[PDB]
Amino acid sequence: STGSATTTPIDSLDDAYITPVQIGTPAQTLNLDFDTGSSDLWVFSSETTASEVDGQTIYTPSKSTTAKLLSGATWSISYGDGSSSSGDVYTDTVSVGGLTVTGQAVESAKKVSSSFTEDSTIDGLLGLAFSTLNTVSPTQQKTFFDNAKASLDSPVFTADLGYHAPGTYNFGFIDTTAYTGSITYTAVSTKQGFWEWTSTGYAVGSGTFKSTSIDGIADTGTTLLYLPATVVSAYWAQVSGAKSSSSVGGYVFPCSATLPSFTFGVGSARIVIPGDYIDFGPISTGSSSCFGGIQSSAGIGINIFGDVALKAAFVVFNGATTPTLGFASK
């Protein structure tokens, strides 16, 4: 089997991407944030504290003939941005782009933190990291990909995120028309539950490539590119007037600037992030100070190849017995 679904930016900045997901019988379609940095499929629901729902579409398990309460199971997750959610668990039928999993754990939110409430466009998350990170207790549950894997034509999914435009998540096949040149594959460590890999270095604009190992995670659920302070300083030093602002919470730059590109290495291959991808617009409405899309990972504890990086590539998440990651230009 295979599946193919379009993923769409939630706003004009590509702050996140939503993908429609069919849950239950008859189908209830919710728009979920596909997150290769976590491993829970959770949704706003009829059980979510009413004051914490503000415009989201909810899953109502009582209206699904295939929903079953997973007795005694609870979940609770906290994300890197400080947001969180928790609740109980149903199993139900879940389909993505024509690919169907029966008995998928659907984690129903009883509580969500304010940032979730405040974002009306995201109805929940669909985790695509390794199932070892799944938070369901006392019996850990599998991700949608893990459940679908054996049935897929090939044990892979691909992320093709757009810049200010829709893109595609495919399951079970590699669309050879979706990228240019070749796909370069690179080793993954699953030791921390992430799609963790090592970039071979970077360049700033038309500058020389610096060969240096950068360990980090391919994370579709993180907006920006978070890299070591040395690398980030080298980037922003090429932008007149750029500075790190503790009050804003990172590097800012004059909105009148033309940003240089940023290249990262995948083996001997190179992925080029155009400068425009690094502009996240005014820090506040009407400001001439703009927020940068490349930020320091210092104090995160891990480097994160988030959407800023991933949307410059066609990315293969290869879930073979020994997982690997593939990157192509597009």
Active site residue 35: yes
CA atoms within 13 A on the CB side of 108: 23
Secondary structure (3-state) at 151? helix
Task: Kindly give, in sequence order, each residue whose CB lies less than 8 Å from that of residue 215, ignoring residues fewer than 6 positions away.
Answer: 196, 197, 198, 199, 302, 303
Active site residue 199: yes
CA distance 285 to 313: 30
Give me the sign of the Cα torsion angle 92, 45, 13, 126. negative
The tokens describing 47, both together, are 């059980």
CA distance 314 to 329: 6
**Which stretches does DSSP call E strand in 1-135?**
3-9, 17-23, 28-35, 41-43, 68-78, 84-96, 99-112, 124-127
The tokens describing 260, both together, are 């240089």
Tell me, yes or no, if the two domains 5-174 and 175-330 fold the same way: yes
Look at residues 252, 222, 249, 232 and name the one whose alpha carbon lies nearest to residue 240: 252
Q: To one decimal place, what's the resolution in Å?
A: 1.3
Helix (H) or strand (E) holding 295: strand 294-296
CA distance 183 to 186: 10
CATH class of 5-174: mainly beta
The tokens describing 41, both together, are 């499929």
Q: Which of 35, 123, 146, 307 is catalytic?
A: 35
Residue 7 burial (CB count, 10 A):
23
The tokens describing 146, both together, are 């893990």
Q: How far is CA 61 from the centre of its chain?
A: 26
Count the helix, strand and coil residues of the chain and give each as a percent rounded to the nearest 5: 10, 45, 45
Look at residues 72, 185, 201, 93 and name the one whose alpha carbon lies nearest to residue 138: 72
Homologous superfamily, domain 175-330: Acid Proteases (2.40.70.10)
Residue 313 burial (CB count, 10 A):
26
Per the CB < 8 A criterion, the answer to whether 106 and 94 are in contact is yes
Q: Which of 38, 85, 108, 199 is catalytic?
A: 199
CA distance 296 to 304: 10
For the chain, which residues make up each domain, given as ranges?
5-174, 175-330
